[PDB]
Design a protein around this ligand. Structure first.
Ligand SMILES: Cc1cc2nc3c(=O)[nH]c(=O)nc-3n(C[C@H](O)[C@H](O)[C@H](O)COP(=O)(O)OP(=O)(O)OC[C@H]3O[C@@H](n4cnc5c(N)ncnc54)[C@H](O)[C@@H]3O)c2cc1C
Ligand SMILES: O=CCCc1cc(F)cc(F)c1OCc1ccccc1
Length: 647
């Protein structure tokens, strides 16, 4: 349906009130059910008006004018619902044409640290709400971990590049607003072994299905058997995977043992039976001779010796009947051995590609992921196919930056917050002698988790952050993932596949250049460096790592088919001082709850909150994504306006 679709697209149940709405509308939840349905229709229709045209501000008046009778008669309720949706960034978010120009006198000063998607999303909200907002950004550009390389006709994303399903995804709104060219990813992903040979289809399917089985077994261990703690330590996904593989190997060795036992027993029966048949020949050879050694007692002696001879001969033919039914049982047993091994050496390498793919998705070696919680956010996945941004994902933060007071090359060094306000201290990155002091009423910190983890600290908080916050910072995972960009003047790969895989030769290096992406107008290939390889490869120069790419590609397509690239770029996110990694993951011994602790604002002791937090590491249901960063900025903007302008 139409207004039901609008609730779904807003990640809301179309036919009941959320807890958040119950808090804000307690008179509605406690009142008659009929009025609750009116509330839900006003809410849903208001979201539909916005989602149907997110390029213009949806005002209260225009909401009222487009509601059909009887709904356009309860002016007060319509206003209450519009204001609530607006305050929480469910309408009039992103970048859109303002109908109401900005208030000329501001109310409250907010310093936002960092001009990534979360800081930008919050900044636009707070500016719409009539506040004085300034973003301090250490880089010479906006976007943070959205970072697009552009040169000539080449476009390639070094940070985020994939939009997950559009159903429920706020990026569907921003896409319409910014005019992103999205393109669905084709799922075919052929694999090539380290010698460049294609993986045969049957081995590809067999190994992939084994990967699915092994992973489901860890989830059974975790969520049915509650094997999550061992020797007082949290179990990791990698650790659980090693256990389920050990049991598969045990199973192979057992069935092998059973099979050898069947062989041996059959051999022993034949050995015994032949020995018995031997003695029966000796017994018949002795009688067959006493049949030639030969009257009335003689005419009856032949009858008796023929009766005796041919009975042993019938005994012997029957034993040769069992002799065949045994050595034919032996013959098919030797021809049907169970498997020698669980995984052939090549099978294992292929299985390690699927693990590498998973270390890509989580940005970290599997031995670091929480067995119990590594996928705690699964239930919030959007619907629809995934897409890539053919024109470069930077179009989103560049569009969101329009009209904001943004200070580039301005690195925050110290954040001071008291019950009387805040001071942010920053230095010019092009001239670190120049110092700046920004006074404000509130600070919104969107610093990446990697920067918050840095010891000694990059940014100093005065007073120091509370222990409950720093230990959450300490527990949470912050992973790494890197990309080599290869720009050619000609397409030598299969233009109709967006993905192909390189199967590494060893487990430890399985994430090295394991996945290639064909996404762009110009002849560009992105290769991923995942897992353990991601951090280690940053110590390799561009030319050497490009050379290793070209060797892989020369192995797959032929040495003469691969020309030298015209441009190359290599990300080093861990070594990047303004990121120190790629994105959070749920570390063993962490949980979703640490994401909630990260979102919690700080209040100076006895008072009102001064220091606020946004960023991909602060949103439990959508971590490590652009849409999660965006949603987190909208959330903190609502919280800050509630504090400084009233709920
Ligand atoms: C390699 C890679 C691949 C990814 N792929 C997937 C994908 O395809 N799709 C997806 O949805 N997500 C993906 N992500 C994750 C996604 O990009 C991030 O979750 C999101 O961009 C983070 O936004 P943020 O606002 O939380 O942080 P950021 O974008 O990092 O914003 C924080 C900002 O603070 C700035 N800053 C740092 N230190 C200081 C300081 N001292 N003073 C001032 N400013 C400072 C930084 O420069 C930055 O601009 C990927 C990320 C990376 C790096
Ligand atoms: O390019 C960087 C990948 C960024 C990323 C980080 C996430 F936490 C979740 C994602 F959806 C995602 O991007 C698409 C993706 C989906 C599944 C498996 C791997 C990647």
């Amino acid at each position: 349906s139409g207004v039901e679709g609008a609730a779904f697209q807003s990640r809301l149940p179309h036919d009941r009130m959320t807890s958040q709405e119950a808090a804000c509308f307690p008179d509605i939840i406690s009142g008659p059910q009929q009025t609750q349905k009116v509330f839900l229709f006003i809410r849903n229709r208001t979201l539909q008006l916005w989602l149907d045209n997110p390029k213009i501000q949806l005002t209260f008046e225009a909401t009222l004018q487009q509601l059909e009778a009887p709904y356009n008669s309860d002016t007060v309720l319509v206003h209450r619902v519009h204001s609530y949706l607006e305050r929480h960034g469910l309408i009039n978010f992103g970048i859109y044409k303002r109908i109401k120009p900005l208030p000329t006198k501001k109310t409250g000063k907010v310093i936002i640290i960092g001009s990534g998607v979360s800081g930008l999303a919050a900044a636009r909200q707070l500016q719409s709400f009539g506040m004085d907002v300034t973003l301090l950004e250490a880089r010479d550009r906006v976007g943070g971990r959205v970072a697009t390389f552009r040169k000539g006709n080449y476009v390639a994303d070094l940070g985020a590049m994939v939009v997950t399903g559009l159903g429920g995804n706020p990026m569907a709104v921003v896409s319409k607003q910014v005019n992103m060219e999205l393109a669905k990813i084709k799922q075919k992903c052929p694999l090539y072994e380290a010698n460049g040979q294609a993986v045969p289809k049957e081995k590809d399917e067999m190994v992939e299905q084994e990967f699915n089985r092994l992973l489901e077994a860890t989830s059974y261990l975790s969520h049915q058997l509650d094997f999550n703690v061992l020797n007082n330590k949290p179990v990791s996904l990698g650790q659980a995977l090693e256990v389920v593989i050990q049991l598969q190997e045990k199973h192979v060795k057992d069935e092998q043992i059973e099979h050898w036992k069947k062989i041996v027993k059959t051999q022993e029966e034949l050995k015994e039976l032949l020995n018995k048949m031997v003695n029966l020949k000796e017994k018949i050879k002795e009688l067959h001779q006493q049949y030639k050694e030969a009257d009335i007692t003689a005419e009856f002696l032949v009858k008796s010796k023929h009766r005796d001879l041919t009975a042993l001969c019938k005994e012997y033919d029957e034993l040769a009947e069992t002799q065949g039914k045994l050595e034919e049982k032996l013959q098919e047993l030797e021809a049907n051995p169970p498997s020698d091994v669980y995984l052939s050496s090549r099978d294992r390498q292929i299985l390690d590609w699927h693990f590498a793919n998973l270390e890509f998705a989580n940005a970290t070696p599997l031995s670091t992921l929480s067995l119990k919680h590594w996928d705690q956010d699964d239930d919030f996945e959007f619907t629809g196919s995934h897409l890539t941004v053919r024109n470069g994902y930077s179009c989103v933060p560049v569009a969101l930056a329009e009209g904001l007071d943004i200070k580039l090359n301005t690195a925050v060094r110290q954040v001071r917050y008291t019950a009387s306000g805040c001071e942010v201290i920053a230095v010019n990155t092009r001239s670190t002698s120049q110092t700046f002091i920004y006074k404000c009423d509130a600070v919104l910190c969107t610093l990446p988790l990697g920067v918050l983890k840095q010891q000694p600290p990059a940014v100093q908080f005065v007073p120091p952050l509370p222990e409950w916050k720093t230990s959450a910072v300490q527990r949470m995972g912050f992973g790494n993932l890197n990309k080599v960009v290869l720009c050619f003047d000609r397409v030598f790969w299969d233009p109709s596949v967006n993905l192909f895989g390189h199967v590494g030769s060893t487990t430890a290096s399985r994430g090295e250049l394991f996945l290639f992406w064909n996404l762009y107008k110009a002849p560009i290939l992105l290769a991923l460096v995942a897992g353990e390889a991601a951090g280690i490869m940053e110590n390799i120069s561009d030319d050497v790592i490009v050379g290793r790419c070209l060797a892989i590609l020369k192995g797959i397509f032929g040495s003469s088919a691969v020309p030298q690239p015209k441009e190359t770029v290599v990300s080093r996110w861990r070594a990047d001082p303004w990121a120190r990694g790629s994105y959070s993951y749920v570390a063993a011994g962490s949980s979703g709850n640490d994401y909630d602790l990260m979102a919690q604002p700080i209040t100076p002791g006895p008072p009102i909150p001064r220091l606020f937090f946004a960023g991909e590491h602060t949103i439990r249901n959508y971590p490590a994504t652009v849409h999660g960063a965006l949603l987190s900025g909208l959330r903190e903007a609502g919280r800050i306006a509630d504090q400084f302008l009233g709920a």
